[PDB]
Design a protein around this ligand. Structure first.
Ligand SMILES: [Cl-]
Ligand SMILES: [Mg+2]
Lengths: 312, 17
């Protein structure tokens, strides 16, 4: 709770407040975002689940987020990011994007996940890059690690992608407290790193719904590239040991595509449809090499031409 | 070194299990 009607009436209020601010601004009139900020209920603990968190369950709530950020200051935006991180596991979008809680998502559920990802992660990237200081990024990570089961978040594409954004920004911000925060994150992941890879039945289900024969796992390798990057030799050792089977599953998949390419390219007669198939195979074969190499290169390793070796 | 670390990681990765 809730309830459903109350949250929908709250979104309508947010829409009304934003439209008044937008109208005032356009006409070059003085804007006051107090009524709008109060309509959000960020500083509200009167319910089991925070009303703003509940607003994010609805696509209409998600779509107005960039417009809300146009009328907020630095601290207000940070309060929003902190409420999101603090209650990540109680966000229905995380429950929908997790292969554990939602093993069979509907196409509608997948569209909601994708809408949320391109809107909410764009907002977070824009705020953290320009501009947020060390203490604030460290604070968001600690909020995420202390108020959530981190391994459950890594089973969700949004959860994993939110963690990658935070690690990658922290890695850029220092040219020693991060070293302690990173190890707290590593602690919560150790012996569960393989669980970031969804089971085959989940991937087969996502593929049927989108009519595709290849799963995009670039985000999984980007998370791993980031984690290995900020880790010491002992962390990299654990990562390699835990994801070893996934590295060899990706290589087998790429080598299967490499052989399909060679067998079809030798065919004397070639139509535009065989041309399309070969380009599709070449594209997917090269994508697997690139995704795995984003991770391996970080540890000075490279997959070429048929094996893994030290990067020159 | 970065070389010795990379070699340790390669050797670990190349183990069957
Ligand atoms: Cl927990
Ligand atoms: Mg203020």
């Amino acid at each position: 709770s809730g309830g459903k009607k109350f949250i929908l009436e709250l979104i309508e209020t947010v829409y009304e407040e934003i439209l008044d601010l937008e109208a005032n601004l356009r006409n070059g009139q003085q804007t006051d975002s107090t009524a709008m900020w109060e309509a959000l209920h960020i500083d509200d603990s009167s319910y089991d689940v925070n009303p703003f968190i509940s607003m994010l369950s609805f696509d209409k709530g998600i779509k107005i987020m960039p417009r809300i950020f146009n009328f907020l200051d630095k601290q207000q935006k940070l309060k929003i990011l902190q409420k999101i991180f603090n209650e990540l596991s109680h966000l229905q979008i995380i429950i929908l994007s997790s292969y554990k809680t939602t093993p069979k998502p509907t196409l509608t559920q997948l569209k909601k996940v994708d809408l949320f990802q391109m809107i909410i992660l764009k907002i977070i990237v824009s705020f953290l890059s320009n501009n947020s200081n060390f203490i604030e990024i460290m604070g968001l990570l600690l909020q995420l690690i202390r108020n959530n089961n981190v391994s459950f978040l890594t089973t969700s594409k949004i959860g994993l992608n939110l963690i990658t954004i935070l690690i990658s920004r922290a890695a850029l911000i220092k040219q020693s407290t991060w070293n302690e925060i990173y190890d707290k994150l590593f602690t919560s992941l150790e012996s569960k790193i393989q669980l970031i890879f969804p089971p085959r039945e989940y991937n087969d289900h996502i593929m049927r719904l989108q009519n595709d024969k290849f799963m995009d796992e670039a985000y999984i390798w980007a998370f791993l590239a980031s984690l290995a990057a900020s880790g010491k030799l002992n962390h990299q050792r654990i990562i390699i040991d835990e994801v070893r089977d996934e590295i060899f599953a990706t290589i087998n998949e790429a080598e299967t595509l490499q052989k399909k390419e060679k067998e079809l390219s030798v065919l004397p007669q070639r139509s535009q449809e065989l041309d399309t198939e070969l380009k599709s195979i070449i594209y997917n074969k090269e994508k697997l090499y690139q995704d795995l190499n984003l991770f391996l290169n970080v540890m000075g390793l490279v997959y070429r031409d048929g094996e893994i070796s030290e990067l020159k | 070194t970065a070389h010795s670390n990379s070699q340790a990681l390669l050797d670990l990765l190349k183990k069957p299990t």
